[PDB]
Structures are given as C-alpha cells and as structure tokens.
Amino acid sequence: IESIENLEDLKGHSVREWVSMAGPRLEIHHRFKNFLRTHVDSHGHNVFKERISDMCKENRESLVVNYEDLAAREHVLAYFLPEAPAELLQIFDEAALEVVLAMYPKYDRITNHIHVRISHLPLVEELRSLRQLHLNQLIRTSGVVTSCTGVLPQLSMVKYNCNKCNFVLGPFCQSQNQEVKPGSCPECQSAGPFEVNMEETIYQNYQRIRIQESPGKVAAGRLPRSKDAILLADLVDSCKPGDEIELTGIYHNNYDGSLNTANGFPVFATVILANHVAKKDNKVAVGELTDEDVKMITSLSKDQQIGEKIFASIAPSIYGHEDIKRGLALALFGGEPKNPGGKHKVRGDINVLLCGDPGTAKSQFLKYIEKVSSRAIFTTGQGASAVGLTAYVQRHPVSREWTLEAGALVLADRGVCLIDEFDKMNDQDRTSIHEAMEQQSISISKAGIVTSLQARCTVIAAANPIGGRYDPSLTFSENVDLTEPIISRFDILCVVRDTVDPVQDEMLARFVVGSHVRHHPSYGVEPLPQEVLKKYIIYAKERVHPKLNQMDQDKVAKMYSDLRKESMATGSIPITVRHIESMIRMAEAHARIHLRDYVIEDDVNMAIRVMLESFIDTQKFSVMRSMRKTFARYLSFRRDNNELLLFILKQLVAEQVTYQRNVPEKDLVDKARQINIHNLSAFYDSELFRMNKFSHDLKRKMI
Template sequence: SGLLNYYQDRSESEMDDQMNPPFSSNPSQGEDLPPFQDESEADALLGNLGEVEEGEGEELFGDRLERDYRPIPELDVYDPNVMDDADYEALSPSGRAEVDRLLQKRDREEALGKGRMRPGLLYESDEEDGARPSRRRRMAERAAEGGDDDDVSLYNMIESIENLEDTKGHTVSEWVVMQAPRLEIFNRFKNFLRTTVDSKGNNIFKEKIQQMVEENKESLIVDFHLLANAHEVLAFFLPEAPTEMLQIMDEAAKDVVMSMFPKYENIAKEIHVRISDLPLIEDIRSLRQLHLNQLIRTSGVINSCTTILPQLRLVKFDCPKCGYILGPYFQNQNQEVRPGACPECQSYGPFEINMEHTVYQNYQRISIQESPGKIAAGRLPRSKDAILLADLVDQLSPRLSYASEITGIYTNNYNGSLNTKNGFPVFSTVIMANYVERNDDKLAASALTDEDVRTIVALSKDERIGERIIRSIAPSIYGYEYIKVCHRTSQCLEGFQRTLGGKHKDHHIRGDINILVCGDPGTAKSQFLKYVEKTAKRAVFTTGQGASAVGLTAYVQRHPVTKEWTLEAGALVLADKGVCLIDEFDKMNDADRTSIHEAMEQQSISISKAGIVTSLQARCCVIAAANPIGGRYDPSLTFADNVDLSEPILSRFDVLCVVKDQVDTFRDELLAKFVVRSHRKHHPSARAKEDDPLPDINPSSIEKIPQVGWFNGAVEEIQKIHIKDMKYILMRFPLKVLTSKLLKKYIIYAKEKVDPKLHQVDQDKIAKMYSELRRESMATGSIPITVRHIESIIRLAEAHARMHLRSHVNSEDVNTAIRITLESFVETQKFSVMRSMKR
C-alpha cells in the first residue's frame, strides 16, 4: 500500500507538469515532420481550433492530422529538471519495505498529533485539484483493495474508535490486535499512567515508577480497581484477552518509564505491568475449559518449586557453512522454534545457537496446592503448576508456606506423557503468572469490618467472656471444661513467636502452646481435634498411623519435567502459622516421632537430602490425641507409664490432658440427656427451640448451688443436686453461646491486634510454683518438670490476657495459667497421689 501511494503521488506530479510546462531556452526539434514555415500558418491552425463549436468537439482524424505532430519552436520548450525520460529499475524487496516503513511512520505521527486540523478543513473539497487525499481516504482505498467485503475496513474502525467497546462483531482477542484499537488502547493506558492521582493529588504511578527504578526492577504494579474506575473498557478487555492486552500495556508502560528515565533501558530491557487485586478469586478445583486463555486469580500454599533456570526468549543461530546469523526466533512455551534452511547458502543445517546474541529470561516452575482450611470434607487437595518469569522468580517458596495468591493467564501446553497415560490427546494446563502475593496473617484482621471490631470490643468488656468462650468451644461435647480451656488458650497464641530484643534479635522463643490429650476410647478426643480444624484459620489434620516422618516434615523428589530434586512440604510445614492436629499420636513409631522434636520446640525443620540443605519454617502449635497402652487408662500408674512416649517428647507439650471414662450414675444420666437433647434439637424436621420448658424445681435447692468454677470442685458440688434442679444452674449462670463465625473473628482479632506485656507479672509467685512442682515431681516419680514449664506458664498467661483483649498481663492471667499447669500436673499422677494432692 505504501508503494502504491508512492507511484500515485509521482504520477500526479507528472500530470501537473505536463498540463503547465515551464519554458526554457533549449528547444526540442522534431525529426519526422518539417516545422511550420512561418507563424501565420501556426496561427491559422490554432485559430481554426478555437473556432470549433463546443458541441462538435475537436476533429482528431482528417486530412490535416499530420499537422498536430509538426514541431512548434515557441511551444516546444521544456525544463530538463522535471524531465522524466530516464530508465528506473524496479524497487528491491528491501527498498519497498523501507518505503512502507517510512509511510507507516508518517501515518502514525499524523495520528498521534494533538490539535491538528483535518485536511477537509483546510480545503473546500477533498476532491479539489492539487489537494492531497486525506489519510482517512487513503486508508479506505487500501482497505477496499483487499477485496474482502466481510471485514470491517480500517476507515470504519477509525470513525468508531471513540466507542472502543464496540468490537464490530469480532472477538476481543481479534479486536485488540487491529491497528486502530491497539493504538487507542496504547494511548488510553499511557494517559492513565500519567494522569492518575490519589486523594491528595499526588501522581500514583510516578511514585511507583521512581521506586521501581530505585530498586532496579522491571515490574509496575497496577491496581485493577483503579484501572476499572478510569477506563472500564480496558478493564473489560483485560480478562478476556490478557496476552494481547498485557503486551500493549507493557509497551505503553515502557514508553512512560523511558520518557522519565531515558537511560533505564540499559538496566531493564522490558517493563512488565502486573495486575493486582483482581476481583474474583477462583478455586484451583473450579478451573475449567471456560477459563482457558483468561486472566484468573487463585490462592493456595506452595508445596514445591524448581530452581531458577535460564529460558530462551529470543534465539539466533549460526550457519556453520557460510557464517550467516539466522534469527531472531521467538520461543514460546509449547514448542521449540528452529530455522528450516539458511537464507544465504540454502543449507539445512545443523545450526548452532549464537550465545552472544541470544536473549534469556529467568524461569521457575512452582506447584500451588489448595489451602487445607478451604477443602471440603472428604476431598483431597488439588494442585496446579504455575510458571514464574522475569523478576517474579524466587518470590514464593515452600519455606514461606502460608497462603499465597497468583494472578496469571490460565493456558494449556502439550504433554506427550499425559497423552500416553490417558490414551487420547489431551493438554496439560498451567498458570502463566503475572502477579504473585504472599498473604501474611495480618491480612486476616484487615478483613474484619468496623462493625465486627465494635462487636468484638463490646464482648471483651463482658466479665464472663472467658466462660462464654469456653461454652462456645465444641458445644456438642458435654463437659470437659478443662480441655476446652486448654484449646481456647492455644488458639489465642496460634502461630505466635516471641523475638528477643537487644543484641539477640535473631533469637526466637516458641510462642505456640502444644497440647496432648490422652484418655480412654469414646471420650471425644478426635471430636475435639475436628472442631479445632473447623474453627482454626489454618489447620492440617493427620493421623499417626497414616503419617510418616517425611510426611510430617518435608521430603525431596524428582520433578517430572526438569528431572531435578525438588522439596515437598509436609504437614508441619503446611500448617505454618496455624495448627497441626495429629490423631492416634501413639501409633507413630519412635523414628517418626523423633523427627518432629525440632518442629515442636525450635519451630523449624532442617533438611539435608539430595544436595538440598535448607531450613523450613514450622511455626505451628501441635495438638495431639493418643490412646493409653492396652486401650484403657490405668489410674494406678503415672502418665508416662500409661503412654508409649519418651520424656523428650512429653516435655515439649505445655499441657497434658487426661480424659477418663469413669462410671458415675449421676454424670451418666446428664450425659445421656445431653446427647438425646442434642439429637432432638438438631433434627431437620424438628422445630427450632431455644430452651426446653423448665421442670418442677424445689426453690430450697437453689441455695445449695455454690458459685464455683470448673477448677475448684464444681463437678462434685453439682453431683449433690437433684437432676430436676439442673435448670437453675443455667438460670443462676446465664451464658449465651457465641456463634462459630463470631468466635473465629474474636480469636483472629485477639491474636493479631493484642500483644500483652509481662512487666507486671508476679515473678516470685511463678518461681515458687516452679520450685514446688520440681520437688513434687522428684518425690512422686511422675513426669519431669523442666524450665520449659516456666515458659509454658508465661505462654498460658499471655494467651489468657489476649482472650480478654488486655494490653498487660495481670494477676488473674497468672493465676489461671498456674491453675492449668497444676491441673495438668495433678491429673498425670497416680490415683493415690492425685487424691492426696487434691485434698
């Protein structure tokens, strides 16, 4: 088209010269016919032509036809500068390409010009002689020469460019790659980067670009909500055609960055636009064919990753026969592109890669798995591979095992082994990451609304908030208030880690509370673990029989694609900053239990396998349930004799809970009524009732109910009361159960927003308590008391203060921590020793 304009302009110039020939002193003499003898003969000829009537026209054929070809010296005068009688060779392909390039550059400059008048405004008519055809007309003529009436002409596209969302029947992917829409998207996004300001009037992306340049990065983060508010059509096109849109945005961002910092191209050859805060988050298991080639956002935990590898991006080849450099060839993700033949010597190779001119980029492949807390009951977690390129590499790894979010293009690629496995052609899917984000635990508290915060603060002012939380924990389980208190305190310090100040800032002290529940079968030990799994923000449930040492910690395996050794995270690593629940803890062998010693105290897991030497974070509390030796707990033996666990593992548990199935007529009746009432109340066909009607109660029995708690004999006092008087206990101590959703929000707020201080702690009381416990432990031969128990008391006191949203640990918190420690110590003694201690 550019070459056609070149020849058209040239022909128009020749016609103008022929119509108005300039005079010169060099006459041109004819050769075939003699010239006129005098001027009268020529005048007579011209006069006869002027006398011809307009209707008859000029006689072109006749007896005097030869006179038209006789030379006229006065008229046959031409300028040699405009003579075009030389022979011109045809343009070479490279020459034609150069002409087209110059014409396209001129057209782009005209289109990008601001405030420039149209050619139609400069002339009275576009068809006026001597006026150059407008660019719009030339583009319409070029489109018409294509001969395809079904396609929308570029002329029509430019007319409707203001209505960019009207794709003229094309798909979004086809529309955005056309010249006019692409140019409009380029201009709009560049204007968006230059003009977007915050509430204070500061340019948002100017500051981001300056920060990016200071850090020598090549990623510019763009908030999707900002883009949608400024240009809705761009936000609409982006998820539908992400590959094409991101390419245009990258070019516009590079143009803006290079205009601000012209020499930054020496550091970063490309600028990548990263889209953050995409509104919809898709689950990994919900990705379908509908999401292919779409921009998606998903979340999960990183359980494996490869090392950073160099990937070919633009490759050039050397011809060994003639030395010609072939390329560059752009390498895609699906297949390797190689030249067929050398254009210089027509050789078919083999060709060698030119290492000097080949461009590489960083490449890393990771595997993202569904978060354990978001998996439906009975489902296995699913995973999906994601590819990180450029400066996204090494931002996510298994050692940072908390939930991560990936925004990228969900695409497919060819996998021969997958076809062989399935027996028919299928494609494997992968996420081409555009933006990654590590979700810290502080983000959970930011999800709380102002109304939630006001409700939580109001609840903390209730004097009986502790008892309400105890009753709200596992309400379907009758009794066991002591175990519920332990679970409550452990959740308030879930994932917490204390860092020493001063010169030891790198030293950390465990802040999580580990709990071991041991007792007879049928005492709801596993139900407690299941309830914690549902209420905790992040929980990983496993069993000792089905878990191995590497399954709990970490293991290495060969990656199926790269064939290199990769690190896979275990249960403790996946539960980082959460809780790890281990049922049937006694069924584990000694070698497997030994592997979790480091995780329970140092909260890290050291790996030295297959050339990989690293340390993974395992900042989680461990809640385990075990059965005694022989199936039943023997009260005549100590706790250490009833369980098949070593002293090192027992000392790492802050609280030891013993659950005994004792025969008691009164308690058995209460338990049976509670179970029957629970089944009747939660039956689908039953009508919801808040309370049952009160039975006949003897008012004189009210005075027999002392105001005592669970820790100083409440069960023994309640046993003296007739069963029909139990309703007065609820009337005397009215407690409203918190919903599981509100309880979870309360625990999240307490754990993340409250950090109680310890300077008001009664140190003498804790020191005296520790010395007496060690003396009794040596005298009775029960579980050993170590310095870890002092830290356990401090952790329990901090957790109790967090539960009440207090900024300081007071004497009530210390007393509660001491009661829990004493109860744990007494319950692990022999029956005779325990009875004497209770007295």
C-alpha cells in the same frame, strides 16, 4: 483518535483483533483508567486509591483487581477480558502504570511496569475438564503444586553481539514458544555464531510449576491429571510443592514435535500462562487486611472482656471444655521465640496434648484448629511415619541425585501440626518429633546430605489412655503409656473425661440438638465471628510482638519448687525445667490475645492458673482435693480483689463527707493507680460496691 461510544458492537470482528486496533484500544485504556480512579466500595471508600497506596508503600509492582468489581462497574471490559486476555491485560498494565505514576510521580525509580492480576474470576474449571474450547482464554483452576523449578532468569527482550563486527542486533521479544534465532546482521549480513549481550539484555524471573488435581477431589484408585504453569516476574515463589492453590491464567497451546512423534497425531503441548496465584490455605494474608479490618481488630481489642470472647470462639459448636478452649487459644496465638546472647535458643510455640475418653470431641477440636489456622497439617497415628513427619531423602524424579524433601513438621514451620490418635503411633515414628518439638529443628544426615531444617511448629496431639477409658484410680503417668521425654515436651496437658452428671448431660444434649438444628442445610460471653477471628489471629501473630518486662519472679519460682515436690511425691507427671518456660510462653500468648505489646501480671496469673489446674487434673481422685487446697491456699489463684478498692472508696467518701460537713471517681482511680490494684473494671462490675449503694458513670465521674 475519537472516543468510541460503543465498544460492544464488534462490527463483525473477533474480540482479539477488535481490541488490537487503535480505536478500541484507546477506549479500553481510558475506561480502565477511569475505573481505577473512580471505583468505590459499598461504604463509598475509593478502594483502588488504598490498594495502589499500599502497593507503593511496599514496592510490590503488582495490582490485584477484583473481577466482580470490574464486571459490576465497567461491563465491556469484563466482557472482553476472558476472550482476549493477553491483549486486555497488556492494555490494563499500561493504564495501571499511568494511574500509579499519577499518584506517585517518582515510582518509575522502583518499577517500570505494573502487573494487573485478576481475582475472583467466575470462569472456574476443573483440571480434568479443560478442552480445546478454553484455548487462549482466561481460565481459573485449582490444584496442589507438585513440582517447582528454581527461579531462573529468562530472556524477555534480548540483544545479540554480531559474530564479526561490533554491531548489536535489535530487541527481539521472547515468546514462550521457541528459541529466538537472531537472523542476520543488518550492517554486514553475517549470520554466524551470535552471542547474547548480557548487559544490554532484559531478563525476567521464570518459574515452571506442575499442579495436579487435589487428592481429595480425585477419585479413589484413580490417577490425577496435571498441568504445567509458567510464573513470570513477581509471580515466582507464589507457591511451593504441596501448596493448594487457585490459579488464574491464559490456557495456551503450541506445537511440540516431541508430542507429535510420541502420539503419531499432530498433538499440541499445553501450558497455563499464570496471571494470579492464590493459596487456598491463606485466604487472608496480612497484606490483604484493609484499614477497615485493622480498625475493627484494634477497636475490638479494647473491649476489656476480649479474653473470654476469644476463648469462647474456639470451636463454638462444642459445649463445655472451657479449659480445652483456653489452652487451644493460648497455643493458637502462641508466644515469642527468644535467644539471649545469641547462644541459647528457647522455643516460643506452645504444645498441647488432649488425652481422654472416646466421644469427647478431641478430634473435633483438632479439626477446628485445622480449619481456622493457616498452615495446618493434619495427620493420624499409623498414617504418619518418622520420615514423613520430619523429612525424607529421595532420588530427584528427573535428574536422580539424592535430594532432601520437607516432611509435615517442616511444612508446618510457622503453623500447627495436628496428630490425632497420638498414642496409636509407633514408638519409632513418635520419637522422631522430639527435636522438632523442643529444638524446633530437624537434622538429617543421609546419603551425603548433612543439614538442619527449621521446624518451628506447634504440636497439638490427641490420645486415648490404656484400654480406651481414663481411670481416676490411677494418675496420668500410670494410665497414658507415654514416657517422660515426650510427656514433658507438651506445655499444656489436658485430661477429658466422660463421667455421668445428669444436669450437665441434659444441658449438653440440648446444646447438641440445638447445634443440629442450627447447622441444618436449610460460659455466658458471646464469641467473635470466625472470619473476624481469623483476621484477628493473623494480625495478633504478625503485627504484634509481646515483650516481657517483669513477671514477679518469687511467685513463679516458689510455685515451680513445690510443684516439683508434689510431682516427685505422686509421680503423676514429670515437671523437669520445661514447665517454667511454658509459664513464660503462656503469658506471652495471653498478652498476644489481648494485643499487648508488653506482658503484664494479668497474663502471668493466667499462665499460672493454666499450669496449676492442669497439674491438679493429672492427679487421682482422693489426691486431687488435697492438691487443690494445697495449691489454692498457698499459691496464686488470684480471682479478684474487690475489698481493697471497696475500703479505698469508703475511706475517700468518709474523708470527703468529713471535709464538706462541718470528682470522686477521679479520686478513686488515682488511689487505684497509686496502689498496685490497677484492674478497677472488675470492681465496677462486682456487687461489693453495689450493695453498699455506690455507682459509676464514665461521663459524670461521680460515685
């Protein structure tokens, strides 16, 4: 077969038969092999070497190709791909298998076929806009998955035992169109009750989903359109009911006598043969992270001011509210679940309650967390129910047996449940979340179903006080209207007030008007870009797991004991035992923010500060100052310790001068590791050595 120098001249054919014949088929095969081997990104890095290597590391049998890259590098393949998608995807699968077995010669033991998936295809279509013009073409659509079958085995290459003799009928390919009837046995011509040879038959995973238009893209009072889609092989369980997805697939039609007799006209059934599923929720998975991305994340973690940067990156368009940003950062990164002895589970997720005045950006904080977090569920007040929050039982739509279904807390199982207008809920709806908040489970005993579902989510709620205005004359317990069991289930408990303060009002006004200028259609520390923050968050949550070695038990124990005393004194907030475990969770969350594999006293002091400041915030005006001096003098607001390193430096300089008269930074840091004062960067940024005329340089190491 001679190489074909121009695929583009169809010479009167259509694309389907043109690429079906051998010459153009081999030319397409070689072009796709060369594309995979030689395509490089803007930095010159061979992207497909990395992608195939990751696929073979993880045994995933599927290779995502970016259509933008294909169109940029090899034009005619991008030209023919949407016109004859089945044929070219078959050729691409063959070529990808050749390249994969060139890279990893033993990968045939793991797979026998590589599925090339296409992403970022510009041929986006609305479900309501699909026409007969799109038939047998590669389309891209969006919608919410509303139904899913179980993963079912489907015949792909089926063999039949002959009904009389021992012969086996040849491989017949399943089509998605009709049942394959064997015909007659070529040995003996019998055509009786044939039966499938299960052992010699090749099966494939099958899953039929129904997607419909997303409820925010449909018009009000209008019914949504929907399509069936077939997921085959490793595309099964790419989505669940409720998932917003983008779906690339072949728009396929076949004759259906049922539709013909339903309509009275020869109407053909339609289905999408899915090629690529991408959840609009998970725009970036952990598998999508490249070596550049993880190198960026790990190098960025070494900044040593990263905690302030991460805190500042929480809702960068909101002035002030540094304590809110801190608490939301800790909740967003989260702690670690633990189960000592396999018999005592304790939650790792941190729950947050933002109570306070109108127009104080509580809802804006909640919508920011919704936007930034993967697996965010947002709900509001009366719009939620006990049943809808937790889980619900219904007659199955077609078969009519009772079936359990996932509520918001179950759907957010490794994510965030956001409850705006939390005080406006019904008590019966609000009490439903207790088990999910603490025990991280939802137990249902209804209509013959008796089971517990996992609801390991983090609850971030927003509320108003009684009368819609916080009263410093009263404590939090006196003006919230919530009760102790629900108040104690929130680890971080924030009060936001809108009191007059002219200088802060001027700065806030300038920030707000500057924001309106910046975002037109066209604290000090600087934040991360939000894309980088999302990548950092998912890496920190999935690839990093803090472990607590010690936390200086005496400090936290004494703190908890007298925090209990003052809570009993004022009645401002119940403290129970949950606040201790909140301390451990917040320490683990700060360690995760710093990407530490092990928790340290830096994290413990951060958690201590958060707890004490919020508890102080719950108090009245006069009581608040006395509480401030109480917990500040006696307990640990460990701001800095520069004096010890200062006189260690002075002592070392005095001894060195005395030695020389009659590498100092190495001497200093040696003493700083000998004594438990290891955070020396703070001393090097502080003024105490500077006005004493010392200085530092990481290269010269002289001071």
